[PDB]
Amino acid sequence: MALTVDVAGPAPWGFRITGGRDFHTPIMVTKVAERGKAKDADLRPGDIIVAINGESAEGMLHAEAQSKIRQSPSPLRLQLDRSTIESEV
Ligand code: NA
């Protein structure tokens, strides 16, 4: 599922990221702090960050994506890919 999340600021945003071009992996949210701005914003552990403030995250180094997020104006605009689930009942 593709989605666009706007996170109210300013930093600290209250989430964690993994990955980047130097690890040859995508930028992914791994944790959202229970008391924090990302919790309000509808951001979920496991969301892949496709774009940061309209700029593609594809070729960003870990530290590069980290820095762009921390330096970001409010709101932080993330383009996301989210893994949906289906349960049998
Ligand atoms: Na910021």
Numbering used by the authors: 1 to 89
Paper text:
a type I PDZ binding motif (PBM). proteins are widely considered to act as scaffold proteins. activation through intranuclear sequestration and subsequent degradation. assay confirms that HN12-NS1 and PDlim2 interact in vitro.
PDZ-peptide complex either by soaking or co-crystallization. Ribbon diagram of two adjacent PDlim2 PDZ-hexapeptide fusion proteins. hexapeptide, and the comparison with similar structures. good model to investigate the binding mechanism between PDZ domains and the NS1 PBM. HN12-NS1 are crucial for their binding interaction. of the two basic residues (Arg16 and Lys31) in the PDlim2 PDZ domain. compromising the binding between the RSEV PBM and the PDlim2 PDZ domain. residue is a critical site for the binding selectivity of PDlim2. PDlim2, the Ser residues may allow the special selectivity to the NS1 (ESEV). residue to Arg16 of PDlim2 is strictly conserved in all of these proteins.
